């Protein structure tokens, strides 16, 4: 239970606060880089 019909794309993560798929490029410049986003943001651009 509690799930969306679709799913976030490969370079996105699910933001629980916003409750929304969010691009990781915005969450990779400090602090709490979501673990799913760390791959993408170690490869940068």
């Amino acid at each position, epitope marked *: *239970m509690l*799930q969306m019909a679709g799913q976030c794309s490969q370079n996105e993560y699910f933001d629980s606060l*916003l*409750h*929304a798929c969010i691009p990781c490029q915005l969450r990779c410049s400090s602090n709490t880089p979501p673990l799913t986003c760390q791959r993408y943001c170690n490869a940068s651009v």
Partner: nanobody
Framework: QVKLEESGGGLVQAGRSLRLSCAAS????????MGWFRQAPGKERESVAV????????SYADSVKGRFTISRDNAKKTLYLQMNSLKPEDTAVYYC????????????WGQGTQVTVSS
């Protein structure tokens, strides 16, 4: 903190449909996560549907998936829950809740509305 007022519920035969409404005092599109919850007698309160910031993602409980749909009219400032193919298991008090996108917990609640599905 937004105020929410619910409408629409009542008694409905099984297999029919019902649209619940929840009017907000302010705009919610880019400001609040919205949700529909339900609670049966003696049972715990469970989430049914959730719509997020700018309606990017909608989430549904597995029991209602494919039958219920949550939507948001920002011009009317109204949250809708469309309920199709209703079953007796859907009988409960339904609440609409909202929370600011920077708050983890739902902090505003509607009065609640009874939905009873006849057999």
């Amino acid at each position: 903190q937004v105020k929410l007022e619910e409408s629409g519920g009542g008694l409905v035969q099984a297999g029919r449909s019902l649209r619940l409404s929840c009017a907000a005092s302010e705009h919610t599109f880019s400001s609040h996560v919205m949700g529909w919850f339900r609670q049966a007698p003696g049972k715990e309160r469970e989430s049914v549907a959730v719509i997020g910031w700018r309606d990017i993602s909608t989430s549904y409980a597995d029991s209602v998936k494919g039958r219920f749909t949550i939507s948001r009219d920002n011009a009317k400032k109204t949250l809708y829950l469309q309920m199709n193919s209703l079953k007796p298991e859907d009988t409960a008090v339904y609440y609409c809740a909202a929370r600011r996108i920077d708050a983890a917990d739902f902090d505003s609640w509607g009065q609640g509305t009874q939905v009873t599905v006849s057999s």
